[PDB]
Design a protein around this nucleic acid. Structure first.
Lengths: 149, 95, 127, 210, 85, 98, 76
RNA sequence: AGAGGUGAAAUUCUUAGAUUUUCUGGAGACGAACAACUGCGAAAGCAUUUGUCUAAAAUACUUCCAUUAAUCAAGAACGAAAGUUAAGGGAGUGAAGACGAUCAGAUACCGUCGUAAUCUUAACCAUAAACUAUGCCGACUAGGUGUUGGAUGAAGUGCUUCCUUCAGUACCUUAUGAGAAAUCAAAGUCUUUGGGUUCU
RNA sequence: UAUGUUCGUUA
């Protein structure tokens, strides 16, 4: 765990079966179209996979089609300029700052805001080390509120 | 050199425990460290029970009890003999 | 016929107030305490002082006509000490031997839900 | 003293004895009317002494002087509270005690603050030491108990509310409603106090004394 | 560049009057000369005109406020209690 | 999470559909009837707000009172200026219709 | 002896060979005879295909399901 | 007609009614009992109800990304109490001080009073035996009794208990493990000496 | 749970 304590080994473990499940008679000629429709209707890939798993019974998009969901979402040009986790961290930091500008006495909120901003900077450095973010991306704390886009 | 494993108190997973005040001397003592005796006593001794229960009415009147719940600092508890010094090995026995 | 008073007994490691009033608490009939019984500037909390305080409060109640008593016990206060003082024992003892009838007994010592700071420092009394 | 004289005390018709004792006054000489010296007198009277039963000995009712006629005083309900010994008996280590309070106005336009207490039950096959409840369960229990307080107090007059205090219908109902969430042992109205009462009406006082 | 290390706007007073007096007057002239948020137009353009009067440069609308800040905590809490009811 | 839902809906509307903000554009749009829904910021001057709702009820279009002021609405729409008035010419893939 | 261990199923997740405890199942409501796929440890509400009826409430685990229905493992 | 208070007293209050009893109104502080070798938090710390705002952690996951990580000079946020500044508050306690005692003396311990302080807001200060005197991350090594929070499976009466498991949190026994020993399940896996890292 | 101080230096 990056900050605080607690190992928290809670996670999801993929099955040994790396292939598409035998019982799935459905065809991958339209799974990508389904996720494309979901993304257009407006859904982040993290929860696109979840609604695909629950409401469509097609787990492991990587097994149904040989490609991962964010990859094919990019291949259709859908993917947003700011990735999942960076955007979620930005949103959380924005909410914290909005709370703080009203409650100046929330020292605990200030500490958590510093922690989440540190996480934002670490993740941003990684994502712009990859070409997944323009080299001038900075996360100005003044402009982050509208930066969500 | 670390007389007791628990340091003479019962604090774990905690940083600060609010103090109470000794019932005898009034000294501030952390609540987790104080010697606490819940004292449930008769109002009066057995002879005065016998006399009141005949001088009363209702012919079945039951004398109310007294719930005191004292808490003492280590010095006051030792002086009042609520706790003994105890030998090194018996020091680990708690019940 | 059985006429009732309320005897507020106050025992506080010093003199023992025996204070008999009517039912409402107002309109006090007789208060004796323990100071007027012993003239030693001390022993005011003694069971002997409380017994002598009670065995004349009984005579005055007998004269006043009151024949039964509701005992109402009090131990100093919310910040000083919760246990009734030494004289409480002999107070009800002598009230019982006095011959007047006794009803309900209750401990009405003021117990603070708060924790107003008690006297002495955080190091307590050193004597 | 010689110049004093006795007065008798009466209780409302919903009790049993209706004559719970005696009070005394000083001289009536002006300007001391020796009746304003009675009005607004509060008497702590045990339910056992009001109803000749040992079972309810742990409750005391406050009866307030409200009218003097000739030599007997009439009084009225002015609050109740359990006795300190019983309250301290109900409290044991290893259980969580849930306290609730509410302010409720009756149809008679009487404003009351009522405080109830409750504790958790061990039940049979637990084979543990503690019956602690989660804070969420405590909060739900307190909400339910406060809702019951206001519900079975705002739909009635004062007289029937006092009348149902005697058989503790509030406590049984709170047990029944909270059994579903966490089993509770003895829950009772710890204390009821009068916040505000309507203007005195000797008529309405009589239509409960008679 | 940075023209004063700490004296800020009180540099107008030079060395005169005590340092504590200058610091205390700084702490409130900072908020006296500030621009506040006009709740009527949403533009942060309301400045103090006279001791208790605050005018928005956009709406031209003026409100009664504190001596040195648009609102005072006492009146802010006072209004809040009324709004609660 | 009471106004966050419509903030998300509005963000998706900016992403997909086409819209217009400003008093003049809103009046023009729902005078020609092209308006679908109109957000009014809580800060909107009373005369302008009333003319807008009168216009919208004449043209049979919905009006939603935004929780925030013209700064909050401006940010919620992703812009760096105040809005105080918004018309959606067509809903994109947004459930803001219901 | 850790290779031919056989009661690793009762073991905690990520045992000698990590393997999810969840699965997938089909549901047949009696009097409805509907065909649709369901995920054990489902996370959101789910509806039927033939006649819309609530099927399982999403909890921290295997859901509460319904008082009836014939639910069958999809394993091969 | 005494009351406070003490080892015993006295200072102190007290026929102008003290203390004591009952009621009403105000005030500030505190939040007992429940309350625990319990919970939360980075630490300092956090305990009356309700609402709103905010965050975290554990668990469950066939959800997403795919090395984004560990520890870190500089630097930064927070940091008990006391103390400082400015308004407010000011009951109780009470560094100073003033008495009364005790003593050879007593400037102390004890008692009566009592200023600052203690509380609120806005700023400083940056220190505590700020202690489990034990840096952080990772792996391995053992039994049992508990307990806190999830999850799985099973059963007396829709309810209630047991099993398994994860994450906390303690405790007891054991060491042909360690240690100078006290002791330690980490302070072990160290002359059979090297997983990474910072500070001293 | 009143008061009760001190013991020159070296070997």
């Amino acid at each position: 765990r990056m900050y605080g304590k607690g190992k928290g080994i809670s996670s999801s473990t993929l099955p040994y079966k790396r292939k598409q499940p035998s019982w799935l008679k459905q065809k991958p000629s339209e799974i990508e179209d389904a996720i494309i429709k979901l993304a257009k209707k407006g859904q982040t890939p993290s929860q696109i996979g979840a609604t695909l798993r629950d409401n469509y019974g097609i787990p492991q998009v990587k097994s149904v089609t040989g490609n991962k969901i964010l990859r094919i979402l990019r291949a259709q040009g859908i993917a947003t300029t700011i990735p999942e986790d960076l955007y979620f961290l930005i949103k959380k930091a924005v909410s914290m700052r909005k709370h703080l500008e009203k409650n100046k006495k929330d020292k605990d909120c200030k500490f958590r805001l510093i922690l989440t901003e540190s996480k934002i900077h670490r993740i941003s450095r990684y994502y712009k080390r990859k070409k997944l973010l323009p080299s001038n991306w900075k996360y100005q704390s003044s402009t982050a509120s509208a930066l969500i886009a | 050199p670390k007389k007791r494993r628990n340091g003479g108190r019962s604090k774990h997973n905690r940083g600060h425990v609010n103090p109470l005040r000794c019932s005898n001397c009034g000294r501030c003592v952390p609540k987790d460290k104080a010697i606490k005796r819940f004292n449930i006593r008769n109002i009066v001794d057995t002879s005065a029970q016998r006399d009141i229960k005949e001088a009363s009415v209702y012919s079945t009147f039951q004398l109310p009890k007294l719930y005191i719940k004292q808490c003492y600092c280590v010095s006051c508890a030792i002086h009042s003999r609520f706790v003994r010094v105890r030998s090194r090995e018996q020091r680990r026995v708690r019940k | 016929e059985l006429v009732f008073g309320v005897a507020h007994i106050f025992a506080s490691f010093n003199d023992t107030f025996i204070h008999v009033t009517d039912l409402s608490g107002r309109e006090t009939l007789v208060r004796i305490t323990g100071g007027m019984k012993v003239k030693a500037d001390r022993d005011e909390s003694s069971p002997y002082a409380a017994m002598m305080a009670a065995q004349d409060v009984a005579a005055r109640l007998k004269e006043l006509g009151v024949t039964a008593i509701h005992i109402k016990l009090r131990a100093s206060g919310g910040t000083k000490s919760k246990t009734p003082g030494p004289g409480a024992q002999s107070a009800l003892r002598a009230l019982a031997r006095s011959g007047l009838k006794i009803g309900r007994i209750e401990d009405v010592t003021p117990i603070p839900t708060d924790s107003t700071r008690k006297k002495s420092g955080r190091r307590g009394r050193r004597l | 003293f010689t110049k004093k004289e006795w007065y008798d005390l009466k209780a409302p018709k919903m009790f049993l004895v209706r004559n719970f004792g005696k009070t005394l006054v000083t001289k009536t000489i002006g300007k001391k009317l020796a009746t304003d010296s009675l009005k607004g007198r509060i008497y702590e009277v045990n339910l056992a002494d009001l109803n000749n039963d040992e079972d309810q000995a742990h409750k005391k009712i406050k009866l307030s002087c409200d009218h003097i006629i000739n030599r007997d005083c009439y009084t009225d309900f002015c609050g109740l509270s359990i006795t300190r010994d019983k309250l301290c008996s109900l409290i044991r280590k290893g259980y969580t005690l849930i306290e609730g309070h509410t302010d409720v106005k009756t149809l008679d336009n009487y404003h009351l603050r009522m405080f109830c207490i409750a504790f958790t039950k061990k039940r049979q096959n637990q084979t543990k030491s503690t019956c602690y409840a989660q804070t969420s369960q405590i909060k739900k229990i307190r909400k339910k108990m406060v809702d019951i307080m206001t519900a079975e107090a705002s739909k009635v007059l004062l007289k029937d509310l006092v009348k149902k205090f005697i058989p503790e219908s509030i406590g049984k109902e709170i047990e029944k409603q909270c059994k579903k969430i966490y089993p509770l042992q003895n829950v009772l109205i710890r204390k009821v106090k009068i916040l505000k009462r309507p203007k005195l009406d000797i008529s309405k006082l009589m239509e409960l004394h008679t | 560049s940075r023209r004063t290390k700490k004296v800020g706007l009180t540099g107008k007073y030079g060395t005169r009057y005590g340092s504590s007096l200058r610091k205390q007057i700084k702490k409130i002239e900072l908020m006296q000369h500030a621009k506040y948020l006009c709740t009527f137009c949403g533009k942060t353009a309301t400045k103090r005109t006279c001791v208790g009067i605050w005018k928005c440069k956009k709406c031209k609308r003026k409100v009664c406020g504190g001596a040195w800040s648009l609102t005072t905590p006492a009146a802010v809490a006072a209004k809040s209690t009324i709004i609660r009811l | 999470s009471a106004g966050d839902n419509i903030n998300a809906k509005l963000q998706l509307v900016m992403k997909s559909g086409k819209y217009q903000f400003g008093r003049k554009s809103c009046l023009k749009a729902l005078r020609t009837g092209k308006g679908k829904l109109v957000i009014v910021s809580s800060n909107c001057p009373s005369i302008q707000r009333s003319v807008i709702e009168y216009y919208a009820m004449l043209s049979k279009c919905g009006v939603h009172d935004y929780h925030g002021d013209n700064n909050d609405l401006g940010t919620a729409c992703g812009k760096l200026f105040r809005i105080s008035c918004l018309v959606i010419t067509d809903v994109g893939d947004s459930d803001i219709i219901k | 002896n850790p290779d031919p261990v056989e009661e690793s199923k009762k073991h905690k997740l990520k045992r000698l060979i990590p393997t999810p405890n969840s699965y997938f199942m089909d549901v047949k409501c009696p009097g409805c005879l509907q065909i649709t796929t369901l995920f054990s440890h489902a996370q959101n509400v789910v509806l039927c295909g033939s006649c819309n009826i609530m099927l399982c409430q999403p909890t921290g685990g295997k859901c509460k399901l319904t008082e009836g229905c014939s639910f069958r493992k999809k394993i091969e």
